[PDB]
């Protein structure tokens, strides 16, 4: 295939979580949530994440309950069997911007913005791909590229024409922690956030792996001593042959 048809492969950026012993930077996760909430959530759902999932990762229980309680969700019917709404609880999932695929496509000139809960695992490249894509819209498409209508040129996207326009510009978000919200900063934060969303066990997983590595290594060393110890009579056997 042409390189165009594949898409440009994203650089390997040094993410905080790269590294056998490294967790996510939780302050980055929190900032990334704020970018999701203010920019992506206009078009993209995050359906697999519940309000409770933010608690003790990015937000305290109170902050998360506040976010949930601002929304209305479908309750069980009342006593006359009429539909009712309730305020959100921590067990509720973060609600999407569109009721169905058709509504989503109608709002996006035919293109369907995917759910972002797994997008970091669902693309070759992971965080690097999300980062590269959001930061990689050239001012002008390379001379000779013919974009289909409602497409934007982005070399990281396979085929080059993506239905999502550039969305991150310096100062579209005002971070609550005083971090300067440059395009690159916001892309790094949101890409961290989405990576966490795709694999929320990541921090625990790597810590348990460290314990496992240590114990299994020790057992491997000792198993070799024990093997050599038990086998030494067979290895050290000697013969004397006298033909009868």
């Amino acid at each position: 295939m042409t390189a165009a048809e594949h898409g440009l492969h994203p650089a390997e950026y040094p993410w905080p979580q790269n590294g056998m012993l490294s967790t996510f930077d939780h302050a980055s996760l929190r900032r990334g949530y704020q970018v999701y909430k203010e920019v992506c959530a206009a078009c993209h759902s995050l359906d697999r994440i519940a309000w409770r999932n933010l608690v003790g990762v990015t937000h305290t229980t109170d902050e998360a309950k506040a976010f949930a309680e601002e929304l209305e969700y479908d309750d069980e019917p009342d006593d006359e069997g009429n539909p009712r709404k309730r305020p959100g609880k921590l067990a509720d999932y973060i609600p999407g911007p569109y009721p169905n695929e058709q509504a989503a496509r109608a709002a996006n000139q035919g293109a369907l913005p995917p759910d972002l809960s797994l997008i970091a695992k669902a693309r070759h490249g992971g965080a690097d791909y999300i980062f590269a894509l959001l930061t990689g819209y050239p001012d002008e498409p390379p001379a000779g590229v013919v974009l289909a209508p409602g497409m934007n040129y982005n070399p990281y996207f396979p085929g080059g024409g993506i239905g999502m326009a550039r969305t991150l510009f310096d100062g579209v978000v005002e971070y609550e922690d005083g971090t300067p919200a440059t395009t690159s900063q916001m892309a790094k934060d949101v890409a961290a956030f989405l990576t966490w969303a795709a694999e929320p066990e990541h921090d625990e997983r790597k810590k348990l792996g460290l314990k496992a590595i240590i114990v299994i290594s020790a057992m491997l060393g000792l198993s070799v001593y024990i093997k050599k110890f038990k086998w030494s009579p067979i290895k050290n056997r000697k013969f004397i042959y006298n033909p009868p």
């Binding site: 295939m1 042409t2 390189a3 001593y225 050599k228 110890f229 038990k230 030494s232 009579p233 067979i234 050290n236 056997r237 000697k238 013969f239 004397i240 042959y241 006298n242 033909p243 009868p244």
Partner: protein
């Protein structure tokens, strides 16, 4: 073709004396350094060709094929690609 202990199906053995010592009387790692270095070198040297020849050949094949494929799908390779299809 195989029996069990006591009637394993060996031809009759006679004339071999076997000697060994207890695991507790032996140093399990005796001469391990010499073996790890000199013995492994001997054993590897003896088998090296049987790995190197097929691996080097198939790697060369793949390298040539992947480089040609890459070149055919460039601008420069347009004409050669047109003929190949």
């Amino acid at each position: 073709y195989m029996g069990w202990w006591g009637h394993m199906g060996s031809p009759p053995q006679k004339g071999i004396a076997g000697y060994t010592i207890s695991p507790f009387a032996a140093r399990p790692f005796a001469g391990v350094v010499h073996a790890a270095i000199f013995n492994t070198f001997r054993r590897t040297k003896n088998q090296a060709l049987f790995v190197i020849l097929p691996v080097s050949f198939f790697y060369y094949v793949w390298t040539q094929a992947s480089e040609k494929n890459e070149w055919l799908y460039t601008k420069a390779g347009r004409h050669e690609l047109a003929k190949a299809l």
